[PDB]
Amino acid sequence: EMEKEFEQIDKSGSWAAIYQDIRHEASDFPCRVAKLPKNKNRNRYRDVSPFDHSRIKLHQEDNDYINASLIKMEEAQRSYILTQGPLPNTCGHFWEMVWEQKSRGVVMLNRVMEKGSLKCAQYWPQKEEKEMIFEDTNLKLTLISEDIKSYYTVRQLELENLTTQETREILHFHYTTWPDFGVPESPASFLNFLFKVRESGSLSPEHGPVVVHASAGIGRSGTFCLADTCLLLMDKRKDPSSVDIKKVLLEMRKFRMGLIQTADQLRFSYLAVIEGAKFIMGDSSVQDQWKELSHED
């Protein structure tokens, strides 16, 4: 059981050892297409590459590469696309992927500039009168509206294919206070955000997989996806306590390398699932408590 395990590891002070065991047991698959010379400028980091078997392929005959992976969680019946923060030359590819994969939501867990360094490109328009045209892929992106909160921002974007004139509404969920290789302020602030993404309809199987990213799209992204998947599993299993977080993370790591980058991010995933379990059990009032403790207003 996860709660008794959490307390046992917290008392022993063995979080570093538990996380190092997951890293040792983690899958190792080829990333041949990612390491190809022509794809060097399409990768933000040399040590973060998608596996060939799970990589997302663009529908262009020229070069189908994008540093993105499809996490297919079979039992939980949910899929996520984890990608890197797009580079100045891959912003068109990013939106081409969103279009082709029919994604309705994009979850951003980082900031454009963290500690005076560019971690992600400004891939979306900041002003509504200033739309962005990606000439390479023939796509137009316009900011419709934005709801700014204390630690997160929800944006309504319009994505248009200029060849067909087809229009789609994309929701952009931006967590603005999650530092690199860090954890959120509290389980309440994380869960309030996760449930806002859930209630929007962006995670529905009627749409394509949600795009989740950070700078590399492995650390903060892995924490978000692990918490979401573990909460989904304890709803349909009829035995909530049968969910093993470490096993779910190893299953996720079969699709993209290095999901969850620190021992504290793993510990936080436990805290997030234990606190989130209260809502899944039937107590509706805990969602209202998360809204108060998150300090969104």
Binding site: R44, Y45, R46, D47, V48, S215, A216, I218, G258
Partner: peptide, 6 residues
Amino acid sequence: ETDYYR
């Protein structure tokens, strides 16, 4: 930097 894994 061109590395993420520290």
